[PDB]
Ligand binder design. Structure first.
Ligand SMILES: [Mg+2]
Ligand SMILES: [Mg+2]
Ligand SMILES: [Mg+2]
Ligand SMILES: [Mg+2]
Ligand SMILES: [Mg+2]
Ligand SMILES: [Mg+2]
Ligand SMILES: [Mg+2]
Ligand SMILES: [Mg+2]
Ligand SMILES: [Mg+2]
Ligand SMILES: [Mg+2]
Lengths: 155, 53, 121, 56, 43, 143
RNA sequence: AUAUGAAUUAAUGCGAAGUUGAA
RNA sequence: CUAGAGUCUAGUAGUAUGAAUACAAUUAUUUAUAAUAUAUAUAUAAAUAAUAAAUGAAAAUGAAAGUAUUCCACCUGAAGAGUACGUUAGCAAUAAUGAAACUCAAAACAAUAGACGGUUACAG
RNA sequence: UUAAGAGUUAAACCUAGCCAACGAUCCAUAAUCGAUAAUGAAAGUUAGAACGAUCACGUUGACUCUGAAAUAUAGUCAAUA
RNA sequence: UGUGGUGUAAACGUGAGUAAUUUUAUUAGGAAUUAAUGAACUAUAGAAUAAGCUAAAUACUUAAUAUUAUAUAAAA
RNA sequence: UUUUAUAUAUAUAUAAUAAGGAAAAGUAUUUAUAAGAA
């Protein structure tokens, strides 16, 4: 659940996009898995695969403590019309200053107001909020009236 | 995402894994024991030539 | 620089405003008495014979004040009123004597910017 | 500290062998080799002594 | 040994007593400043 | 209700029936835009002297009990300081028994070696005439 | 101690046209 | 420079491109291993050089002066000034901490074209 | 003693503590604040005149009576004029 | 202009002191778990006696009549 | 891929074999708003 690991993942995706690599890997943790799934469902990532450090898994493998150390989540990146779909990725809640917003301030952020010096939501943008150990889009978090921590911003 | 990420090992698996790891460690000890005994064997073989008297 | 360093005291430099008329102790003007009237040469490139006076104020400080206008009627021990403003081409005269107050009269035969020079019409 | 005393005493015991060896095991191995030939006493004793002096 | 204190309080005191140390020695800040050597006559 | 705080005991026994409890709260610093913690040390009343340094406790507001002591110990959330005290007291002698028997064993092996020649005996019988390996074999067999 | 004045006294800022060295 | 010893020892004193983590396209050399049968113009790594993208005021950097995270130290125009005073240690020397008023619209950095130099050579 | 806790004040006896480089103690300065005023895009910054809320004082210091509540713009004593 | 009752703890003005040892701001904050205090009105009941001293009294004195601490239980 | 077949010592080397094909028409409020010059 480290914001440090998530920040490292965000920078890794940015770098992978800038050099135009089709397939890369990230740590296989539930925060990373939920993050990758939310990016993928919104069309930012081409595909998710299970794998090891060497590469994606050929056949299905059970996840146990024996192999957990070398497990990796292989994300495939989308490049459309000679441009990267996942152009940029940022962390709103830094490990120093963590931003836990109530639902009203999330509505304000989605409505264009700057709360706690957070630049509000933009049209083509995606903001992720973790509530009670589940990652979800900020719009859905508002839809479920869930208080949560705002994590990141991928544009 | 709802399901647990990893299936924790049952205690039977824990015991079996203990057996494997102890086998590895004891095998290393066994090799080292062979080597020390062989070195002692060669030392005693040639100890005729050494001069203690 | 870092959030803790910012917290511990570091930050943007204070855009501090110091007074350009310190001896007026945050007053628009102050009354004063002219000890002597002195003629001084400004810093070059400018060349002139500029009229200034040494003034003891009512708060007790002593200042140097430029006497504007074509003609000054100020002698020693005259009563004057001093406002802020420095003679730019003369170092050390940080104040302006008011014309039309105390023993300083309005500029004679002044017809434009009369208010600044104490003239009447 | 009693623990340190015992540990540092074990080093200075009258006869303790190095490199992972102990007197009992070397004795067993020497006697075993001596037996092996079956299927002058002075020389074998001083040979043993030289071995032990080597490993002290 | 500080970590041992946090993890296993019993084994920690067992260990510091066996090795000849009070909790004060482990817990406090220590450096071999020469004043330490003068205090305990290290040389 | 009466003010209740959760804290950690820091100083105990320096005083009579009084302890010091470190209390931590959350506050929003607008200047740095951070939800940061703030610390304060409360002089708290301990009656019964059931407090030890390193205990997590709940302190509750009371009448003024001294110039600076307006709180009293309410509940020991965790008694880890008491555990430390007990374990110290136990260890001081628990190690001692093991040390004594260790010394006995060490001197006993000294004596056993002191009794120790058999190369003479072994040779006399020849004139008329690995355990770890077996343990490895056991481990392999069970595996 | 907080101030206010002080013979005696330390340093430095400016400017006038210059004077002297060659760092 | 100070003490003890017969010149030595023991000293006082403390001057004269931050660290870590994740990631980041090539080429060419080497370098160290791991192989397979000198050949696979062998793969895996680190060192060196030129790059790409990226960054930068540029020079230039180019696996870092790049993308990100965390911790610390430091800077806030020039001069006054690392000065004065006070304190801190020191027999002292010195060191550390360290201002203020006044004066000015300056000052500085990289690079561009120039004329300049006993600056270099080279020619006509 | 008080209607009432408390080294608040007075008495007695114990313990050695408490605060402090996230700045004590000391010094200088200041009445404090708002749904008040000024300003800014805002965070904030400034003022505390005016409207309103709280405190302190009624030439200076201490004490006393009354009283539920006062060291009262009261009384006594002293200081200054 | 004699004896008495009520009123001047308010309001008015000021910002000296005050960096908190009692000040200001805030809390759906507390207890010691604040008095047989009503200060001045409301709604209810009752009572309003005797002497003295004042020149006299609704002035003053003296006297008459009208919650807490115990003990027993009950609960929480 | 999978399943079997032969051979060899439950396993190994070889040969063959592959189940994923569906069609249908019609069914605004967008929000707060930060400029520089010599
Ligand atoms: Mg004041
Ligand atoms: Mg103020
Ligand atoms: Mg005031
Ligand atoms: Mg006001
Ligand atoms: Mg007014
Ligand atoms: Mg008063
Ligand atoms: Mg007056
Ligand atoms: Mg008074
Ligand atoms: Mg009043
Ligand atoms: Mg009456």
């Amino acid at each position: 659940m480290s914001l440090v690991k998530l920040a490292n993942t965000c920078a890794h995706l940015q770098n992978c996009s800038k050099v135009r690599v089709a397939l890369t890997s990230i740590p296989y943790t539930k925060l990373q898995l939920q993050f990758a799934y939310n990016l993928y469902q919104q069309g930012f990532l081409s595909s998710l695969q299970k794998g090891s450090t060497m590469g994606p898994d050929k056949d299905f493998v059970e996840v146990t403590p024996d192999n957990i150390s070398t497990r990796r989540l292989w994300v495939g990146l989308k490049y459309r019309d000679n441009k990267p779909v996942l152009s940029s990725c940022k962390l709103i809640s830094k490990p120093n200053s963590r931003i836990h917003l109530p639902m009203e301030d999330m509505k304000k952020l989605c409505s264009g107001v700057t709360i706690r010096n957070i630049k509000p939501l933009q049209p083509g943008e995606l903001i992720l909020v973790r509530a009670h150990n589940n990652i979800m889009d900020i719009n859905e978090a508002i839809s479920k009236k869930l208080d949560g921590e705002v994590l990141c911003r991928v544009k | 995402m709802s399901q647990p990420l990893l299936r924790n090992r049952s205690p039977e698996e824990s015991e079996l894994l203990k057996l494997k790891r102890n086998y590895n460690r004891s095998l290393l000890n066994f090799q080292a024991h062979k080597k020390k005994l062989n070195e002692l064997l060669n030392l005693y073989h040639v100890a005729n030539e050494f001069i203690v008297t | 620089a870092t959030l803790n360093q910012i917290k511990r005291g570091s930050g943007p430099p204070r855009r501090k405003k110091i007074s350009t008329a310190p001896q007026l102790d945050q007053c628009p003007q102050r009354k004063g008495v002219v000890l002597r009237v002195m003629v001084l040469k400004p810093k070059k490139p400018n060349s002139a014979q500029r009229k200034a006076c040494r003034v003891r104020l009512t708060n007790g400080n002593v200042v140097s004040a430029y006497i504007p206008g074509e003609g000054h009627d100020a002698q020693e021990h005259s009563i004057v009123y001093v406002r802020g403003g420095r003679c730019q081409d003369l170092p050390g005269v940080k104040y302006h004597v008011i014309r039309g107050a105390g023993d300083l009269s309005g500029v004679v035969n002044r017809i434009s910017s009369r208010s600044k020079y104490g003239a009447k019409k | 500290t009693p623990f340190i005393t015992r540990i540092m005493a074990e080093l200075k015991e009258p006869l303790v062998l190095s490199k992972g060896y102990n007197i009992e095991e070397v004795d067993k191995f020497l006697a075993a080799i001596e037996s092996a030939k079956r299927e002058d006493i002075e020389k074998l004793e001083d040979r043993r002594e030289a071995i032990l002096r080597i490993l002290s | 040994l500080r970590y041992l204190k946090r993890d296993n309080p019993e084994k920690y005191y067992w260990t510091i007593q066996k090795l000849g140390l009070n909790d004060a020695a482990i817990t406090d800040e220590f450096n071999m400043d020469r004043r330490y050597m003068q205090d305990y006559e290290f040389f | 209700a009466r003010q209740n705080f959760l804290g950690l005991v820091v100083s105990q026994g320096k005083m009579q029936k009084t302890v010091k409890v470190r209390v931590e709260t959350k506050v929003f610093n607008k200047k740095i835009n951070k939800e940061l913690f703030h610390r304060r040390d409360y002089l708290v009343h301990d009656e019964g002297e059931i407090s030890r340094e390193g205990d997590l406790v709940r302190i509750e507001a009371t009448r003024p009990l001294s110039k600076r002591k307006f709180f009293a110990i309410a509940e020991i959330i965790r008694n880890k300081g008491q555990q430390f005290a007990l374990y110290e007291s136990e260890a001081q002698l628990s190690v001692a028994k093991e040390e004594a028997q260790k010394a006995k064993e060490f001197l006993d092996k000294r004596s056993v070696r002191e009794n120790k020649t058999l190369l003479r005996d072994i040779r006399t019988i020849q004139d008329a005439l690995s355990g770890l390996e077996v343990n490895l074999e056991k481990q392999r067999s069970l595996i």
